[PDB]
């Protein structure tokens, strides 16, 4: 049997397929699109989040009168990003200067089902008995950007287990050909919760650089041993 | 092979895994979350809807300047609920008084694929030939609450087949640590339709206590016999 | 093993299940529903997009006070449609005159996993090595209609691979019993991108009848050979 | 000089114009409309909230291809309502049975500017020096219903000063010709605040019948003496 | 005394101020803007709808970290338009080719208050006793476009009384410098209602070229005689 | 005659009423509220934006079953703010520590109509002939925060003319009793446009501290001389 998963490097290099899986293709890490203001995501654990080719506008829309428009309005695409910093000017990137910002991915064929498990603690959870580890990460749940629109990940999916934590894990691109980070680009992570605190008022916390991971749930991606 | 499913008790007791499946873990029935007003759900048939630990705030958000905030705004979580009535005062629940309201779940490993089928009638549908029954229920399609935001279930998924019908099957919780039912918490169910009525104007109906199930589609959850 | 997929005819005839799969049931092509303004879709590759019975109102909602309302507000359903033209008057369709407009579907059991692959070009992509073709099509990503609400397809799913391209692939139906096409019913397709253009400003294009497919990505639906 | 204001009876009888103003016309109390999901209100203090003629569908929409549609989709109108109770069945009202539910209004010409003032207490505020009282009421700020869409009042306007407090001050009507109250129809009132509490954590309260007004700000409508 | 009103030519020529008013300035007819997906309109009867200078991007946004961005995302402006047809290609307009599409306006000082009255019939309503006519028109209530966002007019305001009926009375412009009409650009007009029909099911109608005005309410703009 | 306007100090001191107007009352600068996710603003030029008393929760909501809830969900209020910096920790403010952050206002009675005029340049516009200056400022058009919801100002109103430019002119408060600035709190300002550039592609710009005002339109608030 064959089950297809995606791995995201969060760098300009394609990731290696995990041990016991084989590579199908490599591409660019698509997070979601926004057309006519409506966001639609592709689960990061699935082949849909790995497009063979990048574009700031990877879709087009058609109206009921048989007229289609490509990159001819104000639509968006969103992509997982690399550690590349914003330029000092903080101006949107255009053309070739976009490339260093876009995460790469690989689609891999697994011989069995692949899942994520989440600890809701700072400790990496163990795979269920009979399952083997593929990778470890941080519990990535949802995101919003323009218009507070966005999408999210299935916690059962490898897409909810991002290998590198980033406060700004994705970049916003436009039909007009620009990309940038924006002040309202938010990432939402499964949080830690202590057993004694489950029913208590959550203890509010604002975390700064160096402490961000103290409240982020950890995860492992696991494949059934057959 | 192994395929993971979730069963929800809709009570304060964890459900038993259905015959022919084995238990992986138990948890609390997460329906969806709402961050920066945007709702994101976890399919009730999948492990993502079963969190090991409850919290009124099971996530945190981070901004592009490497500052994260936990339970420090006005965000929500939503959980499948129990038969526990609202207090007479109808005041939000805090602390330990939340526990009796939260549904429990179990994640189970099945040896084969698990599906839901729906009748669009008051009769329970039969499993496809070659599939065996795991449980029966009511066709649960979507829900909305605060800001009319919400999420839904895949009808192909066991998550669309809720074992106990409830007009109010889920409770709303807040980062501030409260939970309650609200007047705008809506549940949407796959409805019945008679064959002769498929193309006709739907006959509008308002149903009261005792008659609610007369227009709710029934379902069965089925596992492929291998 | 068994994995369930859906095929949509986009005609008033049920489609035949592809070679190597067996029929489970036939129905009507449900795209999404909209209740209390919130859209919720059923992935076109899954059994949830194939309802045994059509209705302009295939759901009902319940409030927390144990009162349910069926077809008693202003809610919507959306269905894949046929080549049937709008009447000259462009008035909404009622009753039996709706039937010629609604696409049919079949749910088929496959012996192995079924995926879609997308080329991002005008050429049909090839199935991965070890996978066999079930059908070819056009990369269908998302849609919006009333209130710019909508839903979309998973690119990994057969639901993202529509066999016939249509500018207007779906019709809007109402609880009141009417259906029609509307000026704001938009379809969004995965677009073509040339390798040399990936980082460049997308070349904006408005396409008219005869040229629409020049910028639509192609796809194939593939089943793992076991 | 002449300045036009509206008074709303919240009954099936037109209100009398206040002392020192003269009647222009009488009508029906329009609160807001909702077209293509988007709400648009008419300030209750202005002539726009007083339509000469009632209809469940008082508007029509046109598309860019010179086709207009009247009462041919799923649009709404909202009207201030009377003390008429919901029928026991809680079914939507149709036809002549709608009339007892709709508030009446009168548009009056004032010789000078007319304002509202608000106390943020259970005591009626006094008119500014040089202004005379026209009526007293309760501070009505905003409302939501279908899709959590809605509109509100300007606190400087007489429209923010509703003469009779009602938990359910408005009814929802549809293009299809029905009206009803719905569980998600919310009214928002300017609340009371004690001076010592301005910076403190607000003391959360759930109020039941008999106590609702204990936290509602009071208002007066005032006309400049010339 | 002085009260400022706006008149819109719906042509490339500035309108003349009505008899008994004097010109303050001339400009371009701004309908609304859309920033971070949120629409905000300027009442067409007020000076805010008459900008001295046109731009496809007449605003800029700032974030809390003292960084402002001008025309550097995917934001919109909307302007009342002229009778200029779409080019045959239906491609967005850029640069100088935008000018023929943009309506002009004049801001005029009136010696007294200026109102609109609406008939809800195909007959022009009369001004209230003591008020004189400035112009006649059609009852323009609201509009939506991208993301079904939009804004509307106050029926008490001259802005709700558009002198020329147009199915497509406004054009959409973008920060990137393009303008076009789009399939989802909707105009909403106060409709006609017969007295005998007020409580009846509205008679649904689809109107084509030549018949559009048969269901549009008429209006007059009136100034108090002092 | 009397016309009421509001002036906002953007400091912890009440502003003085401008020359030729007299004080009615002083209060706190309310920008908008957000209930059940829906934003509703009070025009900054009007008395509604000046509340006698501050509260993080200045409203309450009621449901159709005669139950009202005050500060018992996840609702917001937004207030114009002072130059007070965020604490270093960037944690939300509670209790008395909120006071230094909240702008004060005064409501003033003018003997004639008060307007704003806007230059769309870095130069302050002149009052129309026959009008006298009350104050000068910067053209403040709209704002968004939580859920990208927000409201805006009428450009004809003094509320669109803010006396001190601030990148972060408003603070977000919650029913739970906290206030803070958030990464997605955006302010939108009327921008400058050169005459030669009106029809050209807008020249995109990202401005940093020291240069922000280079693209902000200026305004004056003017009162008719009687
Ligand atoms: Cl675009
Ligand atoms: Cl930004
Ligand atoms: Cl929170
Ligand atoms: Cl409630
Ligand atoms: Cl309905
Ligand atoms: Cl239409
Ligand atoms: Cl309608
Ligand atoms: Cl209801
Ligand atoms: Cl822009
Ligand atoms: Cl279009
Ligand atoms: Cl609250
Ligand atoms: Cl933040």
Residue numbers in the entry:
A (entry chain A), B (entry chain A), C (entry chain A), D (entry chain A), E (entry chain A), F (entry chain A): 4 to 229
Quoted from the paper:
At the C-termini, interactions occur between the trimeric NC1 domains of two protomers, forming a hexamer of these domains reinforced by sulfilimine cross-links.
In an attempt to visualize the Goodpasture antigens, we tried to crystallize the α345NC1 heterohexamer by using an equimolecular mixture of pure recombinant α3NC1, α4NC1 and α5NC1 domains. Using this approach, while attempting to produce crystals of the α345NC1 heterohexamer that predominates in the BM of the kidney, we solved the three-dimensional structure of the recently reported homohexamer of α5NC1 domains. Size-exclusion chromatography experiments confirmed a strong tendency of α5NC1 to hexamerize: ∼80% of this domain was self-organized as hexamers in solution, while isolated α3NC1 or α4NC1 eluted as monomers. Conversely, our experimental results have shown that equimolecular mixtures of α3NC1, α4NC1 and α5NC1 only produce α5NC1homo crystals. Chloride ions were also present in our α1NC1homo, α3NC1homo and α5NC1homo structures at two different positions in the protomer–protomer interface. Our crystal structures of the α3NC1 and α5NC1 homohexamers provide the first view of the arrangement of the EA and EB regions, which are known critical components of two epitopes that reside in the dissociated α3 and α5 subunits of native α345NC1 hexamers. In the homohexamers these regions are exposed on the surface and are presumably unreactive to antibody binding, as they are in the native α345NC1 hexamers. In Alport’s syndrome, mutations in these chains, including α5NC1, lead to a defective network assembly, causing the multi-laminar splitting of the glomerular BM.
